[PDB]
Amino acid sequence: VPTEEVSLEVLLSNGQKVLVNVLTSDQTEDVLEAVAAKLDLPDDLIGYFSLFLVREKEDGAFSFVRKLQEFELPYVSVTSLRSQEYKIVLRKSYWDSAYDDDVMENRVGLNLLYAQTVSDIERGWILVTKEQHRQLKSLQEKVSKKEFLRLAQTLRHYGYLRFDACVADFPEKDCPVVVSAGNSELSLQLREGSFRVTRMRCWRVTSSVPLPSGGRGEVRLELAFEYLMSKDRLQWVTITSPQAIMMSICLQSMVDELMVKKS
């Protein structure tokens, strides 16, 4: 792409707009740094956050497409799709909530975690009851952002990424499911199954050839993981989802974080 200065909108998880001036030829880290500068996030906290390509739904919720990689040009990544529904989003990009401690030491870091946690509750990524949700929105007014976050850390699926409803062949073929990734596992809510990353020997992403529109082609995508169901017994579990690649990215990211910890 010819180098040119452009304006790029980056959204926070709750849809708040952060406008930055960047180059068409700037890569992910350059854009991330520009966003961090605009927000006054310290350099030493940048590594706790990433940029994601998402589709924004009518209701304002985000369906995550991918985490932008180092070689990518975010302006190009989003513009090349030629649709205003696609957005670049900044979100925390680690899994273990222990790292929240590092981020919350800074006011801007804490504000970012608070913002995305409030939106995670609002969008049902964090699982609470109708009554609990009522209480939370109240506590929200009455407690500090820090106190709110410390409570949120104990809530079901805090720190998980939720995917659009899809289907899986666990427990039976073509079962409707909601998949979420977090805490070193994949959660399948059908009843629930919890599949630990450390018990996955491998996973595979597969796609059909592109098919005529039922002017966009369609592809049938699957993520299958080979799971140690019990001693010496491996079993493939297959999820059919347009977000199979994002799921694969989350599995890799969770495995990577475990390895970094191990080292």
Binding site: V197, T198, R199, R201, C202, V205, S248, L251, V255, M259
Partner: peptide
């Protein structure tokens, strides 16, 4: 890569 098989470095069959 995007498609195909990904080996899980974190696989630990130790119960």
């Amino acid at each position: 890569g995007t498609y195909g098989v990904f080996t899980n470095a974190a696989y630990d069959p130790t119960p």
